[PDB]
Design a protein around this ligand. Structure first.
Ligand SMILES: CCCCC/C=C/C/C=C/C/C=C\C/C=C\CCCC(=O)O[C@H](COC(=O)CCCCCCCCCCCCCCCCC)COP(=O)(O)O[C@@H]1[C@H](O)[C@H](O)[C@@H](OP(=O)(O)O)[C@H](OP(=O)(O)O)[C@H]1O
Ligand SMILES: *[C@@H]1O[C@H](CO)[C@@H](O[C@@H]2O[C@H](CO)[C@@H](O[C@@H]3O[C@H](CO)[C@@H](O[C@@H]4O[C@H](CO)[C@@H](O)[C@H](O)[C@H]4NC(C)=O)[C@H](O)[C@H]3NC(C)=O)[C@H](O)[C@H]2NC(C)=O)[C@H](O)[C@H]1NC(C)=O
Ligand SMILES: CCCCCCCCCCCCCCCCCC(=O)OC[C@H](COP(=O)(O)OCCN)OC(=O)CCCCCCCCCCCCCCCCC
Ligand SMILES: *[C@@H]1O[C@H](CO)[C@@H](O[C@@H]2O[C@H](CO)[C@@H](O[C@@H]3O[C@H](CO)[C@@H](O)[C@H](O)[C@H]3NC(C)=O)[C@H](O)[C@H]2NC(C)=O)[C@H](O)[C@H]1NC(C)=O
Ligand SMILES: *[C@@H]1O[C@H](CO)[C@@H](O[C@@H]2O[C@H](CO)[C@@H](O)[C@H](O)[C@H]2NC(C)=O)[C@H](O)[C@H]1NC(C)=O
Ligand SMILES: CC(C)CCC[C@@H](C)[C@H]1CC[C@H]2[C@@H]3CC=C4C[C@@H](O)CC[C@]4(C)[C@H]3CC[C@]12C
Ligand SMILES: CC(C)CCC[C@@H](C)[C@H]1CC[C@H]2[C@@H]3CC=C4C[C@@H](O)CC[C@]4(C)[C@H]3CC[C@]12C
Ligand SMILES: *[C@@H]1O[C@H](CO)[C@@H](O)[C@H](O)[C@H]1NC(C)=O
Ligand SMILES: *[C@@H]1O[C@H](CO)[C@@H](O)[C@H](O)[C@H]1NC(C)=O
Ligand SMILES: [Ca+2]
Ligand SMILES: [Ca+2]
Lengths: 223, 424, 113, 195, 195, 23, 6
């Protein structure tokens, strides 16, 4: 964290220069002897170019270290390096093109349910019990849950608490139906059957316990 | 003299059920230990209800009574009650007499019930610390490199703010920090007197440090050894110690230690703070070569205990002195925990001298059993200096060898302020 | 004041979804095969009904503390609630926590004596 | 005697079971020796259970000493004799079916070990990418230290495996989102990684 | 039902163990709704066919549980105060700080507690491993077992991170290999049965 | 004026009791 | 003195 390092991370950067110089002479010897059409060779060239650019930029400044993520695509050269695994990779990848007629259905279901959640639960999960001294800090454990006003049909606040707006959200504002970006991701998370009951119960505490199940159970069954 | 003798004759026994311990717990309204119900007659001098028949015991809330350590301490500290009453009978004006034990429990006479959450600990009191060791020259080193960012930084900030609370006006302290370049955290640049005002500056400056950069132990320790070799400013000319607040690393800095203290005249105490997976090997090595100790602080709850155990190491030369180290010391004017006003307290350490007549123990006999304590209220001193014979403009006053007034007409039973109060 | 009329507009996208010779054929054939076996799907309904009734008679009286896994949202106090709990366990959502919240030594509930 | 080891067991049970773990081991070694020399020393390697029994017996004898004199802490090496209870299926018709499955599994070993190699390469690549993105960033001031992080290589491998199994992947995704700011256009864009 | 209305006097006993057998009321339509009788006969014929995959998996789970009892028995115990690593050292109360605020202490009791699912017996390990195979709460067990080092002792942060290979192997073999074998066996069995 | 007594650097001290020399 | 604010 925060620009720290040690001796090992200092020597590894030096070794990266040797690795890059080796790959660059490989690129030279294959580019002045063939003149790229294959995907694997093009990927190798892309990795070499990005490595050269990153090394030069880091020597210049001395987001700097943010394009080093292209180094993780170098293990992908082991698949290309042996012809006995390219066949397996192709047999795995070519089994996927029949599944593109299910990916489209999943996408349409996600979009439709995101729009329905936008029209049903938009902005309803932004209030919680706040004690009665003002808005101090969400006085309900480390897990505050949405409530509803006295005129609402959601969860009512406890004895010494009052429902008051101005709250980030159930998961720091990440899980909600505010836009087509939050909703389209909450719907996907529910579709993967992970943490869908949490969203269902947050909605239950928000609007009520009568008709969010018709949404969530149908989404689970269909998608 | 009646606590060293009784402790030596004590036999360490591990079964307390068949043979219960009878005592009065101060903070109360259990097999293995019986409790007493006192009469608690109201009496003068003190401003509460007291019982002159037995001594009360205070045990910290995080110290479990019923342990083999606490219960063993409650027997040999029962012949103290007979010496507590003899002192009171000879001098009827005697105020609180107390034995602060190294275990954590304080036995005081006369018995009186203890005063929200009780955070009292006898091992952190100013009168206990001043008798447990000689004045020091603490210099705190704080690792503010990148790896300490996050939870382990707020644990370091709290830990430094808690060891500054163990320093009196006779000790000298400064706080530094290294993040591949060692610097001070405050406007001081050298050791300061560590009084109420100076410690507030260090506490405020420590709370404002940010973690970013490369760890470098050689530059940090060179700065620390340079600041302990000033001799241009007022100092204590006593225990020269260094606290290193880091998490872990791979650097031993053996070149620096061979350059600055080859004779090992400066102790090094090393602390490993937070939960991490960094190497704690070099951190423990600096604490063994240099005549110090190694402590670990993994959470907030371990801050209080681990920041006050460095006085057991500092008391080792004091025990080996023998009878030459048994001098009564009087603390500054402070407010009594059991509310009585402004008081000063006498102090005398107690040594573990089991096997002394055999001359071969030297194992736990290098540590102290605890610190004695007798309180003298400022009203008692004011009665020895009659005033009504002089004019209304005439008065007495007395001062410490520090400038602090022991008695003065303008000395009020209120704490001194060190800035503008604020609320968040 | 109603919202169920607004949901009609989104259904127009279903018309676009039901296009192409792959999506339409796959969905239609799978729906037809689902319809051709209405009794295989009845076994799951029977299992859910039986287990919901058993859960109602056994764990139906457990107190609803909100710090446990038997709450207002999750309980055995009604047939729809028991069915929803069994659906949650079928989807694999902390089912072991509900199991451990139904162990002996928990509090009963106001009404259940 | 292997499935009777509990926590805080009676002191006589830990004696009966360790004497059994030696007497039965010697008796199984005698079983091996009787079968080998009386049936040909190369006909004892033709079968598959025979080689498995050879390996398990040899491993039991070897690993008994390492726990006998403290060099190594027990790992349950003999529990694999049970894999011989599957011999009771010979009395049933459901043993020619279970032998051909093992035959096919051992015949397609070169394909299984390549599919598993690709599965491991995928995990390694995504572990390195997650280490690059979220390495040294899950350090929030909250009093809880996150366990599923991207700070080491083994920790990154465990986190990527946990995401692959699906359990609590949304929590790691939320930690990654909050590590790059919070809910915002440039910051929340690091969720395509977890998706 | 008749003997339920027959006693009518011991209505504190039997009733709560006789009203549970009332759930067999819907099961009387199996022999009245032909087709429902056929799709119950089909399931009972299919259940006897997977009697190899269900027994081999049970044996593998038993073996893995027996190996896990030798690694994590008496080792998954924790004290509420993280600084205490013994039952005789975890008595009394300790100071807890709410939300890591040093200025707001709270006194809580000190309790020596086990994991939610332990490896103390051979019947608790098979229940701790079933929940891992269902991919529910398995990271909690993983990071609780990583911290275990010694019997009758508390946890140590990242003691044996190399013990996660046990859970990884169990997940790959049981939760990924054998479950997919069961699904594929159902697929192939149905193919042959109906084709 | 500081105290005139100072107790440190005693040769007979143990020095073998750290917190990490054992564990 | 009366407390301030922050
Ligand atoms: C509920 C709201 C509305 C639901 C759907 C409404 C349907 C009403 C209209 C129905 C038209 C049905 C006719 C129809 O077009 O049927 C399908 C398409 O339908 C869908 O895909 C339809 C797919 C529906 C997908 C639904 C998912 C949407 C989620 C809803 C969210 C609801 C959420 C609610 C939340 C509530 C909160 C409170 C196509 O019909 P087709 O023309 O392909 O079929 C014919 C014919 O049937 C032949 O038998 C068929 O041969 P096979 O293919 O061999 O069987 C021939 O097919 P091909 O030419 O393809 O070979 C065709 O010759
Ligand atoms: C003043 O100094 C004297 C000696 O200088 C000191 O008396 C000594 O007390 C200790 C106990 O702390 C005795 O230790 C005996 O031997 C071992 C060592 O601890 C104990 O056995 C176990 O030890 C582990 C620690 O590793 C401990 O956790 C465990 O609870 C112990 N018991 C078990 C496992 O059953 C013995 O129990 C312990 N007691 C015996 C044998 O009775 C020393 O023997 C004592 N030395 C002498 C000369 O008596 C005394 O405590 C000091 N004063 C104070 C206030 O601390
Ligand atoms: C894979 C295959 C899966 C097949 C099974 C699917 C199961 C779907 C789950 C159906 C039930 C969902 C839960 C439910 O109905 O919601 C609970 C809620 C009761 O809450 P209530 O007490 O009314 O609210 C108090 C505050 N207003 O509900 C209500 O308000 C009452 C709604 C009644 C619904 C009746 C039908 C449900 C049972 C179907 C069997
Ligand atoms: C911590 O342990 C014990 C808890 O009370 C105390 O040991 C017991 O003290 C009793 C009180 O003196 C003894 O009874 C008398 O002892 C004296 C001295 O030997 C004699 O008069 C008799 O032995 C006895 N009187 C009788 C029997 O009428 C117990 O004998 C004694 N038991 C043991 C096992 O030591 C310790 O004294 C206590 N520590 C302190 C400092 O008090
Ligand atoms: C005070 O501290 C300084 C440096 O820490 C000591 O070193 C002297 O510094 C001054 C000014 O730089 C100069 O006199 C010399 O460069 C240094 N040596 C001497 C002998 O003065 C200094 O000795 C300390 N003491 C005093 C009285 O200045
Ligand atoms: C042959 C295989 C399949 C079955 C083996 C069954 C035997 C060996 C196992 C299964 C259940 C086990 C018991 C499960 C629970 C307890 C309670 C506790 O006091 C520890 C021991 C004890 C009593 C175990 C002893 C061993 C045990 C009886
Ligand atoms: C190939 C898949 C698995 C990963 C895709 C990664 C790329 C497309 C995404 C994912 C994470 C993203 C980053 C997330 C957050 C920030 C911080 C801020 O400064 C804006 C840009 C930046 C730095 C984003 C740039 C684009 C980014 C790097
Ligand atoms: C205490 O001091 C006073 C003042 O000198 C006097 O009573 C006496 O010396 C002491 N009292 C005793 C010893 O009882
Ligand atoms: C949950 O149940 C009730 C509800 O208040 C109460 O006993 C407590 O909060 C919880 N139970 C226990 C045993 O802590
Ligand atoms: Ca560092
Ligand atoms: Ca889950």
């Amino acid at each position: 964290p925060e620009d720290d390092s040690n001796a090992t991370n200092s020597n590894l950067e030096r070794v990266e220069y040797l690795f890059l110089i080796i790959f660059t002479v490989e690129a030279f010897l294959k580019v002045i002897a063939y003149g790229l059409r294959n995907g694997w060779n093009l990927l190798d060239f892309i990795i070499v170019v990005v490595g050269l650019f990153s090394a030069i930029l880091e020597q210049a400044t001395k987001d700097v270290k943010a394009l080093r993520a292209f180094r993780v695509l170098r293990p992908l050269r082991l698949v290309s390096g042996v012809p006995s695994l390219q066949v397996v990779l192709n047999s795995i990848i070519k089994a996927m093109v029949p599944l593109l007629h299910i990916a489209l259905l999943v996408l349409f279901v996600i979009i439709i349910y995101a729009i329905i959640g936008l029209e049903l639960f938009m902005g309803k999960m932004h209030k919680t019990c706040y004690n009665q001294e003002g808005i101090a800090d969400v006085p309900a454990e480390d897990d505050p849950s949405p409530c509803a006003l006295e005129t609402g049909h959601g969860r009512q606040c406890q004895n010494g608490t009052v429902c008051k707006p101005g709250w980030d959200g159930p998961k720091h504002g990440i899980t909600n139906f505010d836009n087509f970006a939050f909703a389209m991701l909450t719907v996907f998370q529910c579709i993967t059957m992970e943490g869908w009951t949490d969203v269902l119960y947050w909605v239950n505490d928000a609007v009520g316990r009568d008709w969010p199940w018709i949404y969530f159970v149908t989404l689970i069954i269909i998608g | 003299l009646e606590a060293e003798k009784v402790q030596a004759a004590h036999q360490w026994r591990e079964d307390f059920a068949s043979n219960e311990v009878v005592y009065y717990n101060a903070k109360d309204d259990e097999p293995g230990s019986q409790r007493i119900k006192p009469v608690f007659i109201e009496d003068a001098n003190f401003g509460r209800q007291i019982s002159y028949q037995h001594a009360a015991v205070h045990i910290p809330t995080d110290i479990y009574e019923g342990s083999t350590i606490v219960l063993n301490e409650l027997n040999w500290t029962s012949a103290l009650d007979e010496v507590f009453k003899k002192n009171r009978e000879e001098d009827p004006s005697l105020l609180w007499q107390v034995f602060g034990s190294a275990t954590g429990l304080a036995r005081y006479y006369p018995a009186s019930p203890w005063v929200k959450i009780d955070l009292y600990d006898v091992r952190r009191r100013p009168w206990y610390i001043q008798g447990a060791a000689s004045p020091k020259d603490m210099l705190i080193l704080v690792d503010v490199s990148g790896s300490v960012s996050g939870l382990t930084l707020k644990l370091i900030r709290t830990s430094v703010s808690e060891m500054l609370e163990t320093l009196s006006d006779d000790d000298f302290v400064n706080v530094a920090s290294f993040n591949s370049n060692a610097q001070d955290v405050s406007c001081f640049q050298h050791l300061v007197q560590a009084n109420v005002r100076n410690k507030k500056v260090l506490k405020d400056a420590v709370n404002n440090i940010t973690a970013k950069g490369i760890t470098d132990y050689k530059k940090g320790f060179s700065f620390a050894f340079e600041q302990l070799l000033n001799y241009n400013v007022s100092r204590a000319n006593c225990n020269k110690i260094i606290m290193l607040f880091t998490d872990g690393g791979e650097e031993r800095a053996q070149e620096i230690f061979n350059k600055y203290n080859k004779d090992k005249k400066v102790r090094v105490f090393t602390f490993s703070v937070g939960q991490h997976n960094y190497d704690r090997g070099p951190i423990q090595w600096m604490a063994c070569e240099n005549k110090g100790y190694y402590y670990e602080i993994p959470s907030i709850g371990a801050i209080r205990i681990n920041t006050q155990e460095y006085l057991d190491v500092l008391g080792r030369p004091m025990v080996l002195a023998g009878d030459k180290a048994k001098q009564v010391q009087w603390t500054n004017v402070y407010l009594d925990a059991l509310e009585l006003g402004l008081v000063i307290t006498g102090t005398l350490p107690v040594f573990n001298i089991t096997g002394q007549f055999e001359n071969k123990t030297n194992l736990k006999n290098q540590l102290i059993l605890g610190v004695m304590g007798v309180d003298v209220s400022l009203e008692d001193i004011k009665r020895l200096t009659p005033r009504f014979t002089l004019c209304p403009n005439g008065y007495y006053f007395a001062i410490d060898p520090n400038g602090y007034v022991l008695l003065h007409p303008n000395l009020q039973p209120k704490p001194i302020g060190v800035g503008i109060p604020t609320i968040n | 004041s109603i919202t169920f009329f607004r949901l009609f507009r989104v259904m127009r996208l279903v018309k676009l979804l039901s296009r192409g010779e792959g999506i339409r054929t796959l969905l239609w054939t799978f729906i037809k095969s689902f319809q051709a076996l209405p009794y295989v799907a009845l076994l799951i309904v029977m299992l859910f009904f039986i287990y919901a009734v058993i859960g109602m008679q056994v764990f139906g009286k457990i107190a609803l503390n909100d710090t446990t896994e038997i709450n207002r949202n999750n309980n055995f106090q009604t047939f729809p609630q028991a069915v929803l709990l069994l659906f949650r366990c079928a989807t694999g959502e902390a089912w072991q926590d509900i199991m451990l919240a139904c162990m002996p030594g928990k509090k009963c509930a106001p009404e259940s004596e | 005697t292997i499935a009777s080891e509990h926590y805080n067991q009676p002191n006589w049970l830990t004696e009966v079971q360790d004497t059994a773990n030696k007497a039965l081991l010697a008796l199984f070694t005698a079983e091996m020796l009787l079968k080998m020399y009386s049936l040909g020393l190369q006909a004892y390697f033709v079968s598959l259970f025979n080689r498995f029994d050879c390996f398990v017996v040899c491993g039991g004898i070897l690993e008994t000493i390492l726990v006998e004199t403290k060099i190594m802490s027990p790992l349950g090496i003999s529990v694999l004799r049970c894999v011989r209870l599957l011999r009771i299926f010979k009395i049933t018709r459901y043993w020619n079916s279970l032998s051909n499955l093992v035959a096919s599994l051992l015949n397609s070993v070169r394909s299984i070990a390549s599919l598993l190699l690709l599965l491991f390469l995928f995990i390694i690549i995504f572990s390195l990418l997650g280490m690059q993105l979220f390495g040294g960033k899950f350090n929030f001031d909250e009093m809880q230290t996150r366990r599923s992080t991207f700070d080491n290589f083994p920790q990154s491998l465990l986190t990527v495996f946990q995401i692959l199994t699906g359990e609590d992947w949304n929590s790691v995704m939320y930690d990654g989102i909050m590590a790059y700011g919070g809910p915002s256009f440039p910051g929340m864009l690091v969720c395509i990684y977890f998706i | 039902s008749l003997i339920s209305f027959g006693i009518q006097s011991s209505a504190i006993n039997v009733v709560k163990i006789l009203r549970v057998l009332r759930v067999l009321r819907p099961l009387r339509a199996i022999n009245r709704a032909k087709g429902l009788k056929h799709v119950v006969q089909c399931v009972f014929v299919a259940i006897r066919t997977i009697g190899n995959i269900v027994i081999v998996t049970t044996l593998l789970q038993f073996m893995f549980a027996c190996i896990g009892v030798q690694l994590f028995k008496g080792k998954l115990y924790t004290c509420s105060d993280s600084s205490k690593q013994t039952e005789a050292e975890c008595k009394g109360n300790y100071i807890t700080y709410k939300d890591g605020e040093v200025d707001h202490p709270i006194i809580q009791p000190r309790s020596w507690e086990n994991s939610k699912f332990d490896f103390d017996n051979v019947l608790a390990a098979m229940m701790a491993l079933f929940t891992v195979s269902t991919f529910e709460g398995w990271p909690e067990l993983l990071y609780r077992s990583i911290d275990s080092h010694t019997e009758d002792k508390g946890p140590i942060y990242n003691y044996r991170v190399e013990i996660s290979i046990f859970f990884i192997i169990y997940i790959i073999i049981i939760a990924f290999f054998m479950m997919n074998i069961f699904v594929g066996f159902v697929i192939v069995t149905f193919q042959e049965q109906g084709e | 004026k500081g105290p005139d007594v100072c107790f440190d650097n005693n040769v007979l001290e143990d020095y073998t009791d750290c917190g990490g020399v054992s564990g | 003195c009366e407390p301030g604010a922050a």
